Write a protein that binds this ligand. Sequence first.
Ligand SMILES: *C(=O)[C@@H](NC(=O)[C@H](N)c1ccccc1)[C@H]1CCC(Cl)C(C(=O)O)=N1
Length: 352
Amino acid sequence: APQQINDIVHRTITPLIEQQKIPGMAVAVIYQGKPYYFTWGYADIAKKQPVTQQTLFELGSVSKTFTGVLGGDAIARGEIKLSDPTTKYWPELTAKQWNGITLLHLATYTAGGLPLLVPDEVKSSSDLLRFYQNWQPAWAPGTQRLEANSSIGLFGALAVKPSGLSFEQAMQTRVFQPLKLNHTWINVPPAEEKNYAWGYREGKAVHVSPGALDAEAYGVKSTIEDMARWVQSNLKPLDINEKTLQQGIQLAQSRYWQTGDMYQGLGWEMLDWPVNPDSIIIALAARPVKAITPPTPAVRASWVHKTGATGGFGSYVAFIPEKELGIVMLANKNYPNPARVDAAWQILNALQ
Ligand SMILES: *C(=O)[C@@H](NC(=O)[C@H](N)c1ccccc1)[C@H]1CCC(Cl)C(C(=O)O)=N1
């Protein structure tokens, strides 16, 4: 890779790994549309298996970007509408607080305080209906943003209802396959286990535990090769051949709500570029949102990003459409979000 990209990447990631005690890490920088990879340490400390470009890391909430886009694809197909009420696709949702809660609300965490996690005790399809039917909104729809897996996960599940496919088959055939993400999975196949890194939490190797709506909110595992093309796919969607998917990517980067200097998209979050670190550098943060009416089309001078975690993994994706610049950081250690965002910034700002 060009020496500048190489020195910045190393001058930056090295102390990051040393400071955060990161077992293994993969990084991709997309410069003027071409991927450049870097990898350090172990996927499995015990078996001395190193991190390589084909290692699968858990993405955590970064999975939400895939769901936003799958959702955006279903819209472009005319199968769902963001202005539709949630009950249109889950008629059994008769509790009266749902009147007024739309798919847009679910997708953007503005439904009224849906919880950050679907409680662990929710295991069956009846357990889930119960949980949603009994949930008590803290606020009116469209008034505050509370980042939640249970909000965006339901959106993902309902978004694919008209299609007729499982959320997984809709994701595989409508996002993964067209984009040639051949090593990205919701459930890792036995054939691919040899590449599944272990995550680390307190020195113990862990893998994400199953739970309700996990596929739709934090379930996807992937390699930095596939993540790099994912960044590439979102940077220049005009390049994409399948139509509804191209409109889909475009819709996930639309600006629906504004909170501070941040704009909420479908999965992806955006800020105006150029931007300052602290504008982008706490287990719950309820914040008021002003609706963007109508939603602003995807803005090229944005710092489009997404953070994500699991008990054992820390992920981060960030890209600037108008500069053809992007970065992906995959660690098998859930370290602090500010530290990730500073490394990204430190690297991308040094590239223009
Ligand atoms: C997305 O990354 C969120 N975390 C998760 O999805 C975890 N995998 C999870 C899922 C179900 C139960 C427990 C944990 C968000 C929101 C929750 C937290 Cl604490 C978090 C973080 O910054 O470590 N990220």
